[PDB]
Amino acid sequence: TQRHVRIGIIGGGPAGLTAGIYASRANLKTCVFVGIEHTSQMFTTTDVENFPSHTAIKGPALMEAIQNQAEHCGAELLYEDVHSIDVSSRPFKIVHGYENETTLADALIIATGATARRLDCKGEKEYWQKGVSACAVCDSAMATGKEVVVVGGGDVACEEATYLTKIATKVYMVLRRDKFRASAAMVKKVMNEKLIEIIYDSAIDEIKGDGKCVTSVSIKNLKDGKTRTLNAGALYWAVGHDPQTSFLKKGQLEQDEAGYILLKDHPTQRTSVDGVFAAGDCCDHLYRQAVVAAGSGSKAALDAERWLAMQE
Amino acid sequence: QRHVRIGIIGGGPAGLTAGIYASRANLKTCVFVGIEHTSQMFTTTDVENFPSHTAIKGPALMEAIQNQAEHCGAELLYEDVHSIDVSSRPFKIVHGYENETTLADALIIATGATARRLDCKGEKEYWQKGVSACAVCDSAMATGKEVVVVGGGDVACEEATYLTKIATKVYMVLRRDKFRASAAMVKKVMNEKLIEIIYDSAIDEIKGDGKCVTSVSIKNLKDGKTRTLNAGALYWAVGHDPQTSFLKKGQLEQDEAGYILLKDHPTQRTSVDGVFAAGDCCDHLYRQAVVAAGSGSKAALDAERWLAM
Ligand SMILES: Cc1cc2nc3c(=O)[nH]c(=O)nc-3n(C[C@H](O)[C@H](O)[C@H](O)COP(=O)(O)OP(=O)(O)OC[C@H]3O[C@@H](n4cnc5c(N)ncnc54)[C@H](O)[C@@H]3O)c2cc1C
Ligand SMILES: Cc1cc2nc3c(=O)[nH]c(=O)nc-3n(C[C@H](O)[C@H](O)[C@H](O)COP(=O)(O)OP(=O)(O)OC[C@H]3O[C@@H](n4cnc5c(N)ncnc54)[C@H](O)[C@@H]3O)c2cc1C
Ligand code: NA
User: EC number(s) (chain B) (predicted)?
Assistant: First the structure.
């Protein structure tokens, strides 16, 4: 009937599954909620070349290998979504499944990842390989000696734009808000750049090209509904990522504006609530790698093991 | 002369993962693996907690990571590094038996930290047959058995506590008459009914049946009296040695123990700008291959970011 675990892990990605490995091997009863509506960012990627011990591996195959390992080590994998948690009382409560079952957990690890915010756009699909890019340093050959567009106002985008001033002749920053969701040091570097032109209250309407390269971009003001075109050799998407923390309530866990869970005792994975830990992309915007997420998972699980043990 | 974009000192999980990330970023990169140093993963047999491998041998894992780094285009140099110049840029790495110098625009230190093993009768005989230095890593040797943990620090207290869930009984054997650990850990360990604490004693002899450890003999240091414990495993928890001797004290900020301090969490930044540290040479807390590899990636990304000046 009622499930009580020592460690409850919300997320079945690299961070979550790795956490499951360590928690289960500690001989602490452990379950991992993998999700059903949610999936790992790794399933969407085709070829993984930078995970240690694999020259090349498919994301789905990498994820299957790690899942099998978590099962073998004795973690219980549940293909169920978490709807809410309770952090006011211990044992912690986790509400999940189609019938809103409650699982009791003595410690929580949150590894719910993040999503891409993929733009349903005319030319986003057409020019994703060519012209449109998600990484400025990776596709900087497109920017060199050209006019360029960067989307979003945040740390990711603000650093992409300042970098592309070294290469691009002109950098256009398109924000969908009144101001930036970013640091005052980064806004000062951006707003004192002559090669940057900051466009506020705007969204990307269409990406135009010759079929090979992007030659112009169309923008429409949100309030106005008016659209204008900009000549550019490439569009650099840098909107940012959405941590999958919508199941959380305001004041449960300390978070930033974007919703990333904050880490309160570096280099540990401790959150603002004791016995609650966070790992992977849901608390890391800087790095965003499978091996990095996996590293956090291990750290979170070991943090939870030490914390639980001191409670006895 | 060799000039690289990133210089990585160490060819373990952290070092090699940095090499992979830096090489794939199309940066000229070389990794100093060592001749008279080797990765600590070569000392262990069965790795069961590295993600994507249910069971893999330590050497086999390392070979797979090495080949990967080589394939991504990182130059693996099998040579020891004796010193570095960190006052000027490019940074200089002095390595090899002919004291060749290599220049690097960025540095990544990942020399790891060696777990101490103490010599006694049968220690080397039964290494990885019930004798180990990481309880988290080799808990398969402890399952359903009585075991020994040696040491009186925080690590010995953690490792013994971690083992009470796995083993039927834990013996903590202390050379001294007193712990050198936090008041919190000493209280926990002494109130744990599954632990017996032994003071003023050292490990006389590790005993087995040819396949596995089956008993550990303990000798008291004060009176010389011998005692024999019914232990099926022994765990060394008497400290780690960060492999940071090639540094001159003062060059980089460090612990008393010699761990390189990280100065801008959660990054891999050291006290000197342009120099990053990854893995167990800057981590005394977790000490896992997956954690180390994670930090290596973070270090290589910190370096690339820093190189966009
Ligand atoms: C296009 C693309 C390509 C990439 N390529 C690479 C690459 O080649 N190499 C690399 O290292 N990294 C790559 N990354 C980054 C990498 O995929 C992520 O950093 C990594 O997957 C993060 O791991 P995670 O465990 O934090 O989250 P994820 O791997 O995304 O896992 C999130 C998990 O949480 C679950 N979840 C979320 N919400 C809930 C809920 N409410 N209830 C239950 N479960 C929930 C999901 O179902 C999922 O199991 C790529 C990312 C993208 C977008
Ligand atoms: C018995 C035992 C079993 C273990 N089992 C596991 C396990 O199953 N799973 C797990 O995750 N972890 C395990 N660990 C922990 C693991 O060994 C470490 O966390 C990991 O090796 C650290 O990786 P690293 O890259 O930081 O350092 P290392 O892997 O130790 O690599 C250090 C590198 O630096 C090089 N180097 C050092 N000094 C110099 C120099 N002066 N010049 C040039 N090169 C140099 C070395 O040759 C080496 O290549 C175990 C440890 C022990 C003792
Ligand atoms: Na269920």
Answer: 1.8.1.9
Which residues of chain A from 48 to 77 reach within 8 Å of chain B, CB to CB? 49-55, 57, 62, 65-66, 68-69, 72-73
Q: Work out whether the CA dihedral A104, A108, A109, A114 comes out positive or negative.
A: positive
- Please tell me the distance from the alpha carbon of residue A49 to that of residue A59, in angstroms, as a whole number: 10
Catalytic residue from among B120, B137, B281, B282: B137
Conformation bin of residue B277: beta by default, left when phi > 0, alpha when psi is -120 to 50: beta
**Tokens standing for B59?**
């050497």
Contact A213, A231 (CB under 8 A): no
Q: Which atom of ligand 1 is found nearest the CA of A246?
A: 41
| CA–CA gap between residue B228 and residue B198 (Å, rounded) | 12
Q: Measured over all CA atoms, what is the biggest interatomic distance in chain B, rounded to whole angstroms? A: 66
C-alpha span between B8 and B11 (Å, rounded): 8
Find out whether A292 and B299 touch, Cβ atoms under 8 Å: no
Closest to A61 (Cα-Cα) out of B55, B293, B51, B297: B51
Structural domain boundaries in chain B: 1-115+240-309, 116-239
Is some CB atom of chain B closer than 8 A to the CB atom of A28?
yes
Distance separating alpha carbons of residues A67 and A59, to the nearest angstrom: 12
What Cα–Cα distance (Å) separates residue A67 from each residue in A33, A38, A298, B160?
12, 16, 15, 29
Distance set, CA B253 to CA A274, A287, B274 (Å): 31, 25, 14
Core vs surface per residue B141-161: b (16+ CB within 10 A) or e: bbeebbbbbbbbbbbbbbbbb
Experimental method: X-ray
* Order of all β-strands in the sheet with A227-231: A202-209, A214-221, A227-231
d(Cα B174, Cα A97) in Å, to the nearest integer? 50
Q: Is B289 annotated as a binding residue?
A: yes
CB atoms within 10 A of CB B99: 9
Residue among A190, A125, A111, A114 at smallest CA distance from A152:
A190
Contact A267 B285 (CB under 8 A): yes
Report how far residue A187's alpha carbon sits from residue A189's, in angstroms, rounded to the nearest whole number: 5
Helix axes A14-25, A290-311, angle to 10 degrees: 40
For chain A, the distance separating the N- and C-terminal CA atoms, rounded to the nearest angstrom, is 25
Query: Number of C-alpha atoms within 13 angstroms, CB side, residue B169?
Result: 8
